[PDB]
Amino acid sequence: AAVKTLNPKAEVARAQAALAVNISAARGLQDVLRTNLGPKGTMKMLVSGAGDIKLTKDGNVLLHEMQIQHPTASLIAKVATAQDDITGDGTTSNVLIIGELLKQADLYISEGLHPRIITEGFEAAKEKALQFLEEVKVSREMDRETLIDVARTSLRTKVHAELADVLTEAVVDSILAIKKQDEPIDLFMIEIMEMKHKSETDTSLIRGLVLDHGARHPDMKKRVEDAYILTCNVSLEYEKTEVNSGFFYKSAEEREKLVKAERKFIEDRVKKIIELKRKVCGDSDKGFVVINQKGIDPFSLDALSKEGIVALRRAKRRNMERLTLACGGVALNSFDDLSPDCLGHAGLVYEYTLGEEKFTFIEKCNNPRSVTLLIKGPNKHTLTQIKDAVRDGLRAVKNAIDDGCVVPGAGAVEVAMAEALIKHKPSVKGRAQLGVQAFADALLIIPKVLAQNSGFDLQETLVKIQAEHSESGQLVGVDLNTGEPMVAAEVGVWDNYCVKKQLLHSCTVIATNILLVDEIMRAGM
Amino acid sequence: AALVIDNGSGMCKAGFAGDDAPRAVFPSIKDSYVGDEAQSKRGILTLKYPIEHGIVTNWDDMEKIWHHTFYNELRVAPEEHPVLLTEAPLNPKANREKMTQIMFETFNTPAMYVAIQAVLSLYASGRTTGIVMDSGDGVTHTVPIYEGYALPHAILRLDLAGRDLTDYLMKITTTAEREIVRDIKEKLCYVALDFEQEMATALFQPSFLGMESCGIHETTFNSIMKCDVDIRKDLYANTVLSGGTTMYPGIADRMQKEITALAPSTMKIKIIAPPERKYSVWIGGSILASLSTFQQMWISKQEYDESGPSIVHRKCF
Amino acid sequence: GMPKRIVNAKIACLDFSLQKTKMKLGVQVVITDPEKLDQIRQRESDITKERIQKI
Amino acid sequence: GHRPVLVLSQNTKRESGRKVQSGNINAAKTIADIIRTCLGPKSMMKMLLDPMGGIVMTNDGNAILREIQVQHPAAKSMIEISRTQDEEVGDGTTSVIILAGEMLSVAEHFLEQQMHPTVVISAYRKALDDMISTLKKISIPVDISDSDMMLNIINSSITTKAISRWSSLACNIALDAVKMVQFEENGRKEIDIKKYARVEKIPGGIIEDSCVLRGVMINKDVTHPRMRRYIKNPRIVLLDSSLEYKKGESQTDIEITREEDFTRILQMEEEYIQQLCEDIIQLKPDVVITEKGISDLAQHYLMRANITAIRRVRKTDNNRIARACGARIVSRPEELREDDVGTGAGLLEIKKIGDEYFTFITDCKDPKACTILLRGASKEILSEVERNLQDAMQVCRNVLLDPQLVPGGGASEMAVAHALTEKSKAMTGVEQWPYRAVAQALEVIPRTLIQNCGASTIRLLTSLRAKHTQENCETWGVNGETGTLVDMKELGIWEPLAVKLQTYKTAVETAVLLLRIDDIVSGHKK
Amino acid sequence: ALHVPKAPGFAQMLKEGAKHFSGLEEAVYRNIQACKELAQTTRTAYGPNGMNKMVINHLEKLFVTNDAATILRELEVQHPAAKMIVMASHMQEQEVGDGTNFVLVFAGALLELAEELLRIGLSVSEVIEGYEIACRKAHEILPNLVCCSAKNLRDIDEVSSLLRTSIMSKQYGNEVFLAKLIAQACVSIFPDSGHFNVDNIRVCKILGSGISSSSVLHGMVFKKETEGDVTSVKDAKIAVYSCPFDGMITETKGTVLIKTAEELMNFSKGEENLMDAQVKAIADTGANVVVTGGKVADMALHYANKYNIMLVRLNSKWDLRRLCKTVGATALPRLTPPVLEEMGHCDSVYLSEVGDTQVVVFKHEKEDGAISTIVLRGSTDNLMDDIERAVDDGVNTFKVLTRDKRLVPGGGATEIELAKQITSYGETCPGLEQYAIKKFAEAFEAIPRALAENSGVKANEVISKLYAVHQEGNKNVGLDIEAEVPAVKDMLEAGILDTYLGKYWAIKLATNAAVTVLRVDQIIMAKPAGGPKPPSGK
Ligand SMILES: Nc1ncnc2c1ncn2[C@@H]1O[C@H](COP(=O)(O)OP(=O)(O)O)[C@@H](O)[C@H]1O
Ligand SMILES: Nc1ncnc2c1ncn2[C@@H]1O[C@H](COP(=O)(O)OP(=O)(O)O)[C@@H](O)[C@H]1O
Ligand SMILES: Nc1ncnc2c1ncn2[C@@H]1O[C@H](COP(=O)(O)OP(=O)(O)O)[C@@H](O)[C@H]1O
Ligand SMILES: [Mg+2]
Ligand SMILES: [Mg+2]
Ligand SMILES: [Mg+2]
């Protein structure tokens, strides 16, 4: 060929062969991910080269963990990664719709049709589908019940049903706490701490904070009832001078004086803390907890323990904000002019030892604008799975709140959009109508696979559902327990409008760009 | 890919994972065209190399260097490639926090990892367990490594490097003439199994130089004896030497003999010190960055944003 | 931030660098009264400033 | 033994003669055939695989040729001229390759027929000069104040690219960006769309929400969460200096013998940071942006003044923030003046896009810098959108500098080829044949357009070559979407005269270069 | 036509050394087979008649034990499903301390029976439904099977009788001696507060005198020697310092700047006079014993000898913390004399030679303290490690009894009653769940089956007898180890009892592990790494 005469070690796939490559890879991905879709899907186990185990049903995780070296698979994995980074859910469905668009386009390109016409039909169908989506979207006041149904629709796909019923309340309560009226939800204000000791259904929402470390001085209390929290970012350990000072003495007595003096700088900050503590709690009734983003040497730990202060050091840069929003103080980088108004309050602070590590709970805050999800479970992979599930659920509830609209689920919107595309087809000029048909049969992959996963006949279920939607018009989807049509909005099966829109847009775009590929080429050597 | 910047108290020796040689040896590495393709480099050419004795003195310099070892001698972008930097053994935590703040905040690197130069040297030799004797220009280090990680508790640090070595030879003053003594140090300086039979036809012993701490063989022996008694066999039998200092005299067998003497009469000690690829640390870094366990060890950008200097310090205080 | 066109160009050709002043090899700063350190650091830059002002 | 007594080093291979000529010409026309199908509006994408595991899905001639590797020096030269075209005008990077390939192809004829390469070269130079004359003759001016005319000019440049589906959107972006980057100081006009028009690709979202900001955007958050993240009239200060306490350049070694000296020294460090922060607060800013670090004590002092700081920004981002908010970067807060403070920004926001915090300095008035925020399905799609937008912006710039237009659809190629054929009838020497062959070699652009449209080259080219023999038909060309001849005044495909002039010059000069070449040599070390 | 090509799609795009298993045949049955192999590997160690195993790990270290969790840790289990069952067993070891072998046996049995049910035609989903509902029934049932409770954990005869069962499976021959020792140790600890810390039970393994020479010591033992000339003290007034026993030095850098011959002449004398003052202040507080966590200086040691102070050097920081808890002292970061509260006290501190080993003993006379030590004598390090594991089992049982004082009958009695009751529950449940419920019930039979098989008798005769006697109404009946023939007896009247919490958590974790293994349908193994192991686990 052309490239192989100049770079002999070049790999090239031309026109039809290139199409053959790309579509084949897409269909391969679909075959892997088809089983991930829905609550009746199957969990895959993924073993790293080190031997670490992952139990997952998540499309993005599955992609990045499968062992694949294909360029089309790389493209589709990146599209799914963007879907996950922006919406948190929709990756499996993204891959499925991409694969099905490519397959339905191969249906007509094998018949000698040019991919350009299919892509024109794709663009027309995208427009009409986005219109029908905005029309059918359900604008709803996001109440705890609506958000609970949303989070259920996500967690029931990602985890077991009882654990999903737990994570639902956990996630919805978590978001409804860190949420400020008409102010985008900062999910950073939900810490996510995992503990590896108890059952997975013990995963809870602490209306406060859980630090993965505790006090390093033993004489420090392990439980504090009415606590003043001092969130600081001030070094309380020995800091050497920037200018390489060095000490010079002529006598052991002078050496002793210099040893006592070299710590005066940090002794002064410890003294400031101790004076604040004494001035704010003159008795032993209340407690005082210092949480430092920086270090605290053993001398400072002793000095603070002697006065009855619980000092934790080298906390996380995000815990500064989480503590100032949960407890309610001010985070400090200096103790120059500190006042009791710089302190937060916690109605309980205590310590929990788990094997070799320590955790510190800060609870009974007044109205914490930051909370934590304590992911308890008996196994590392259980914890990872629950983390992925709660990420999905948090993104789902956040998106349902941000986008006050919510879309019916169980493939209902896909069925209805397919019918609408099929009714719209004649209005398209030329043979791009065939691309529209392909788009419809691509949209129809969501209910089909759901049936495929619940153990039903794709064709029979899909005809039943489309018939029910044409006779009634009720947005209906798959009942995974009977295989019959069901009204998703009535049974509480909700999807995110943002997710469906992102699916349509990104899937159409990547499928168009793949269909217009006519040469794959590796010639960089 | 993954950029593997090997500082190694040498030059930048930067490149990509998979390359058998670095592509960006900046310190001591066109014109008449149009543009700023020489002036921008002419600025760096006369800039002092920050790392001295295996420790970063001037950070602004180092940052400017890295920036010029990314945009000019690699013509790439760090915002999409993970970086593997290297640090000297027993490197202060503060330097780690500084370089991690530079990479994640300035260069906005998606993920990075800091590896010990001796561990990467051992990697380039193909092994994952053993005790590395790294003696360069300013420092001497014994790093016991088991399962591929430098045990942070048995790192014995003594100081008898090229400088300290050529010192006594100078004794036997002016820059040029002490560099004649150092030229002889650079050339053949065969290690003596026994100085008796070596001077007859004419570091191991502190008294020789004038120190009063320990020999390098004593150092290795005690670094092996501060580890697990089961891995003791592997430490004793996989001692890997590195450093141009230790290469110049080619010391293998004198060490081997006196280490055997110190050790029990059980473990057989074999020292592999013939490589001299002159890029061992770089190749070890490339191997690591090529592996998937490097993705496992990634300090990610999100991790950095969430933890700061704590993520750089890996908690466990 | 510098302009990129000048009309009545008065040109100064210098064969030395305009950088923060560093004491040469045989000169050391040794503080025994911290109150002087600031002023010393300040000269390290003010020296160069004065040269540029003269130009 | 008797070691080889050679004159040249072993491995030194020397070719010579018509084999070298034919080899160079075949390598060139192979480079051409690689991207021949990537020309016009009905082109198809190519997915190239980088050595770094990356992927590049594109239609751009220079992208493709830059991603492939060759060893033949003629192919090297063709890739280099594609790079030249991309750097100079930023469009036509594949038209140039095709034209150069065809010129070399037609010169192969005359070389096989005992003509000397210098004769062919002199003819090529005559033909190039006359092309220049004809282009400058048929060009028309443009009123750059007509935003719609400019949007049509930019559409005629992106119609051949993937963003064509959001063509109008992309057109506005490019136009807006360029109109903001136009800057004049001391009588020097500057459209520097490489340092001051920045493209930030954030995967996710939808492309239709991508926009050009009246300001800049960086990937940054406040240094301390007590700092504001939303400021509606920010006074902004830019710094090249660290707000930390760093060492001196000399050997500033200290010597302590008294007790109070250590504490006094550490408090002196704190006082230095205090004095820097006070020198800054005296200007009463709302936002402070540094290229270097900011110590936590400095953060405390700035926050006390209710100031928001962003710690470690790039010098390029700092320069764009300067141009956008109207500030002047300083390096010594003691030397800070009101003229160096940045007024002009209308809003500073720090918002969460996905799981990242992005700093916008938007709502600026008269910002001489901009950030094009691209949103889309994936890094690959957005890299392609960025390259297409580079094409659009480079075209807008070429227009604003030289407002002359020429017709597209191959109309210009046929008009100039006809003019050259008509002038050739006065030529009586032996160069008339290569000259007319270059005229027939310009025809390849419409040929390629027709081929990529899927139409009949013979019939259409015949009708078009005939149309261009009439009087007022120098604007007639072909559609790359239907395969019919049209008037460009009726279609609207008009390219910048500068683009096509540079195209023709690069093509003809590359042909001259490869024709002069003979006698390849190889082997010798550097 | 001589090669089958990889099918288009995932089969071709898969990497070189990666593996993909899918479906009941390639994945589910292979996982169940692996877990069955695991259960078989550890089955013969279950119970008092369980035999020891000699596992040699990759470092050629030898473990001789019948402790399931130890064997699993020291085995290199590489199959992922078996890895998951081992993860469950280790969670059992962490939560309770005993019952890991129950977890393995029960999980392996549940998975074998799940394979059977899948073969007869049930779906993994229905098997999981039945297993979970049956686990819920087992947890509903177990509280009713509780027969005894501790009723006192400050006693030593009751506590010994209670720990005997946990320390019988391990170290069957000698279980009264060890239970006495562990009861003595556990009750010296366990203050008036309901909190009991297992790290406060220290075990010192010294070699050479048989296990019957083991002893309890209300105090601490350190295989150290004394730094100075004093070796015994009868009214210890211990002063504990985290700092070395040397002059404090600067954190920045220290240089002795001499400018006059007089300063040079006086520096060293000033140093020693300073050291003399420091140690004399310490001695004058009454301290006769000093314990430093850092190094000792020659001059400071000189003056400690002069003023008759016993010096002890503890390299570890945990050893120092535990000594502080023992003696009631406070580790001072300065060499300042201790205040009356910062000082610790001991009825004796002395250097002794237990066997070949020299030891420093901080011994209280009172039958209490914050820390107690068990000095294990023995002719073999491996034997002493096995006895230490038995001690750990007994101590974790004591803690479980501090948490929950309820006890169920052992020797398979609880398992047989559970099997019977869950079978009676499954016989009532209609639908496809009854098969899985009855298999979950029959899985309990694996425990008395393993006990019988290991005792050396016919498991079928034993299980038939147990079913017959439990039908007559006796829920406390289990099998008799003291019988050459299949026999059974009252576990309660014999005193063979297990912990309600032990069984609760073992059933919960085993059921969760089996159900997790079953939920897997596709496995996508990656090519094995040469990576320098997990970074976090070091
Ligand atoms: N209870 C349910 N019944 C029917 N369909 C459901 C139910 N829950 C979720 N779905 C549908 O299953 C599909 C896939 O779910 P999920 O796997 O979470 O999405 P993704 O495939 O993006 O990960 C969604 O389109 C959702 O509407
Ligand atoms: N709609 C159209 N119909 C016909 N020709 C067109 C059309 N749009 C652009 N062209 C022509 O296509 C050529 C541009 O090709 P393009 O694919 O952009 O490659 P290049 O990088 O060489 O510009 C120009 O000659 C232009 O006149
Ligand atoms: N004297 C005994 N007679 C019968 N069974 C016993 C006796 N002592 C212990 N057992 C049984 O042995 C089993 C525990 O033995 P062990 O090997 O330690 O397993 P685990 O590690 O699960 O505790 C329990 O079923 C317990 O009832
Ligand atoms: Mg989902
Ligand atoms: Mg163009
Ligand atoms: Mg037991």
XYZ file of C-alpha atoms in Angstrom, chain D residues 181-489:
309
model
C -6.757 38.683 20.656
C -6.183 41.627 18.277
C -3.826 43.928 20.169
C -1.897 47.079 19.301
C 0.890 48.713 21.306
C 3.357 51.325 20.035
C 2.077 51.021 16.476
C 2.463 47.230 16.167
C -0.658 45.213 15.392
C -0.551 41.680 16.780
C -2.966 38.794 16.442
C -1.148 36.282 18.660
C -3.667 33.440 18.839
C -1.039 31.021 20.124
C -0.104 32.687 23.424
C -3.376 34.487 24.199
C -6.145 32.302 22.765
C -6.170 29.148 24.866
C -8.224 26.015 24.230
C -9.193 24.048 27.332
C -10.801 20.674 26.638
C -12.934 19.323 29.477
C -14.319 15.899 28.470
C -17.993 15.339 29.177
C -20.835 17.689 28.695
C -21.885 18.471 25.138
C -20.035 20.332 22.406
C -22.964 22.702 21.869
C -22.308 24.227 25.309
C -18.644 24.965 24.552
C -17.952 28.682 24.536
C -15.316 31.390 24.328
C -14.931 33.227 27.626
C -14.556 36.979 28.048
C -11.583 36.177 30.235
C -9.502 33.123 31.057
C -9.888 29.824 32.871
C -7.380 27.723 34.809
C -7.523 24.463 36.756
C -7.121 25.823 40.269
C -8.817 26.214 43.630
C -8.367 28.615 46.518
C -5.309 27.909 48.643
C -7.414 28.002 51.826
C -11.120 27.095 52.023
C -11.876 30.223 54.061
C -11.151 32.206 50.894
C -14.043 33.346 48.747
C -14.797 31.388 45.596
C -17.027 34.059 44.030
C -16.074 37.736 43.678
C -18.065 40.169 41.560
C -15.543 43.009 41.089
C -12.126 41.515 41.786
C -9.041 43.675 41.990
C -6.342 41.242 40.908
C -2.596 41.178 41.537
C -0.139 38.987 39.638
C 3.245 37.899 40.959
C 6.338 36.132 39.651
C 7.793 35.867 43.158
C 7.301 33.377 45.965
C 5.278 34.651 48.900
C 7.389 32.273 51.008
C 10.578 33.005 52.947
C 13.359 31.562 50.809
C 17.107 31.609 51.316
C 19.536 34.173 49.989
C 21.739 33.592 46.972
C 24.954 34.018 48.987
C 26.316 31.847 51.818
C 24.070 33.483 54.423
C 25.317 31.150 57.228
C 24.224 32.288 60.717
C 25.997 31.759 64.041
C 23.996 31.633 67.278
C 25.485 31.944 70.750
C 22.696 33.768 72.573
C 19.457 32.118 73.615
C 16.909 34.534 72.124
C 18.535 34.427 68.672
C 16.832 31.279 67.332
C 13.355 32.456 68.322
C 14.137 35.963 67.096
C 15.186 34.550 63.727
C 12.041 32.471 63.283
C 9.931 35.471 64.279
C 11.971 37.476 61.765
C 10.865 35.035 59.067
C 7.255 35.526 60.161
C 7.753 39.301 60.089
C 9.161 39.127 56.560
C 6.049 37.289 55.391
C 3.920 39.845 57.234
C 5.716 42.704 55.497
C 5.254 41.162 52.049
C 1.565 40.578 52.696
C 1.164 44.147 53.969
C 2.912 45.546 50.899
C 0.265 43.622 48.951
C -2.776 44.527 51.084
C -1.897 48.216 50.761
C -3.241 48.018 47.191
C -6.470 46.458 48.543
C -6.943 43.609 46.036
C -9.547 40.862 46.120
C -7.594 38.114 44.332
C -3.868 37.353 44.317
C -2.343 35.058 41.702
C 1.220 33.771 41.906
C 3.435 31.769 39.592
C 5.351 30.508 42.637
C 4.355 29.208 46.038
C 2.432 30.984 48.771
C 3.326 30.105 52.343
C 0.538 29.211 54.744
C 1.372 32.197 56.943
C 1.002 34.419 53.881
C -2.356 32.745 53.269
C -3.360 33.667 56.825
C -2.380 37.298 56.354
C -4.127 37.611 52.985
C -7.292 35.954 54.315
C -7.309 38.399 57.231
C -7.613 41.074 54.532
C -10.427 39.025 52.923
C -8.250 38.195 49.899
C -8.495 35.036 47.796
C -5.251 33.521 46.538
C -4.338 30.962 43.886
C -0.934 29.512 44.487
C 1.017 28.109 41.541
C -0.098 29.287 38.120
C 1.875 28.903 34.913
C 3.715 31.824 33.367
C 1.571 31.471 30.244
C -1.647 31.461 32.274
C -0.300 34.425 34.240
C 0.296 36.315 30.989
C -3.220 35.530 29.788
C -4.687 36.668 33.119
C -2.683 39.868 32.684
C -4.104 40.493 29.211
C -7.641 39.553 30.292
C -8.045 41.502 33.537
C -5.698 44.316 32.519
C -3.003 43.691 35.129
C 0.794 43.820 35.099
C 2.843 40.990 36.564
C 5.231 42.161 39.280
C 7.924 40.361 41.239
C 8.358 42.599 44.309
C 5.244 43.689 46.228
C 7.274 46.676 47.403
C 7.278 47.770 43.735
C 3.506 47.373 43.438
C 1.474 50.240 41.991
C -2.174 50.873 41.208
C -1.320 50.723 37.497
C -0.120 47.150 38.133
C -3.430 46.157 39.733
C -5.923 44.363 37.535
C -9.206 46.140 36.956
C -11.301 44.933 34.065
C -12.373 41.540 35.328
C -16.095 41.414 35.927
C -16.331 38.206 37.922
C -13.987 35.671 39.507
C -15.599 32.286 40.097
C -14.167 28.949 41.214
C -16.593 26.191 40.301
C -16.616 22.405 40.261
C -16.595 20.828 36.804
C -16.861 17.120 37.417
C -14.434 16.406 40.235
C -12.139 19.356 39.499
C -12.085 22.993 40.576
C -11.742 25.512 37.757
C -11.006 29.210 38.200
C -12.774 31.618 35.842
C -11.809 35.283 35.586
C -14.636 35.853 33.134
C -17.041 38.752 32.461
C -14.032 40.932 31.622
C -14.301 44.120 29.596
C -11.853 44.601 26.727
C -9.919 41.378 27.464
C -6.966 41.064 25.102
C -6.824 37.336 25.880
C -9.371 34.556 25.972
C -9.992 30.932 26.861
C -12.026 28.710 24.565
C -13.735 26.183 26.832
C -14.335 23.047 24.773
C -16.692 20.372 26.065
C -17.386 17.071 24.370
C -17.476 13.311 24.420
C -13.797 12.435 24.820
C -10.225 13.692 24.694
C -9.895 12.495 21.082
C -13.034 14.246 19.838
C -11.934 17.398 21.634
C -8.367 17.242 20.310
C -9.836 17.086 16.811
C -12.168 19.984 17.624
C -9.152 21.933 18.873
C -7.216 21.338 15.647
C -10.244 22.366 13.574
C -10.608 25.509 15.682
C -6.922 26.212 15.129
C -7.633 26.054 11.396
C -10.576 28.437 11.787
C -8.677 30.945 13.933
C -5.591 30.874 11.708
C -7.851 31.552 8.722
C -9.556 34.456 10.493
C -6.112 35.869 11.322
C -4.843 35.525 7.745
C -7.988 37.333 6.620
C -7.717 40.216 9.091
C -4.112 40.690 7.959
C -4.712 40.292 4.196
C -8.449 40.766 3.525
C -8.285 39.447 -0.049
C -10.387 36.440 -1.070
C -10.152 33.866 -3.879
C -12.787 31.336 -4.964
C -12.825 27.793 -3.669
C -14.160 24.495 -4.906
C -11.127 24.362 -7.170
C -12.373 27.421 -9.067
C -9.125 29.262 -8.369
C -7.006 26.334 -9.575
C -8.868 26.148 -12.883
C -8.857 29.912 -13.422
C -5.102 30.130 -12.839
C -4.378 27.002 -14.903
C -6.360 28.522 -17.773
C -4.491 31.814 -17.487
C -1.180 29.926 -17.586
C -2.243 27.900 -20.621
C -3.307 31.094 -22.375
C 0.001 32.796 -21.599
C 1.915 29.730 -22.804
C 0.954 30.370 -26.443
C 3.414 33.284 -26.610
C 6.237 31.027 -25.398
C 8.400 29.785 -28.266
C 11.253 28.024 -26.449
C 11.283 24.501 -25.066
C 9.924 25.404 -21.609
C 6.353 25.852 -22.868
C 5.837 22.114 -22.338
C 6.721 21.970 -18.606
C 4.919 25.302 -18.164
C 1.700 23.935 -19.665
C 2.216 20.755 -17.658
C 2.211 22.779 -14.443
C -0.986 24.361 -15.696
C -2.453 20.882 -16.132
C -1.015 19.963 -12.707
C -3.029 22.614 -10.893
C -6.176 20.775 -12.038
C -5.568 18.080 -9.396
C -7.372 19.981 -6.613
C -10.812 19.839 -8.313
C -9.971 16.309 -9.477
C -9.429 15.224 -5.882
C -12.584 17.056 -4.789
C -14.631 15.213 -7.422
C -13.033 11.866 -6.568
C -13.786 12.306 -2.862
C -17.334 13.349 -3.723
C -17.831 10.154 -5.727
C -18.425 11.637 -9.165
C -17.051 11.287 -12.692
C -13.697 13.056 -12.983
C -13.522 13.001 -16.810
C -16.956 14.501 -17.495
C -16.905 17.136 -14.760
C -13.327 18.228 -15.394
C -14.115 18.515 -19.097
C -17.167 20.700 -18.525
C -15.191 22.781 -16.019
C -12.078 23.263 -18.156
C -14.488 24.361 -20.887
C -16.410 26.705 -18.579
C -13.149 28.411 -17.666
C -12.504 29.220 -21.340
C -15.451 31.637 -21.342
C -14.996 35.205 -20.126
C -16.588 35.686 -16.692
C -16.238 32.150 -15.342
C -13.090 32.348 -13.211
C -15.315 31.778 -10.168
C -16.760 28.456 -11.361
C -15.796 25.346 -9.427
C -17.268 22.117 -8.069
C -19.212 20.960 -5.023
C -17.516 18.455 -2.788
C -20.930 17.175 -1.698
C -22.887 16.583 -4.935
C -20.424 16.544 -7.840
C -21.655 19.448 -9.960
C -20.168 22.675 -11.252
C -21.357 25.869 -9.569
C -20.508 29.536 -9.340
C -18.606 30.202 -6.135
C -20.464 33.512 -5.867
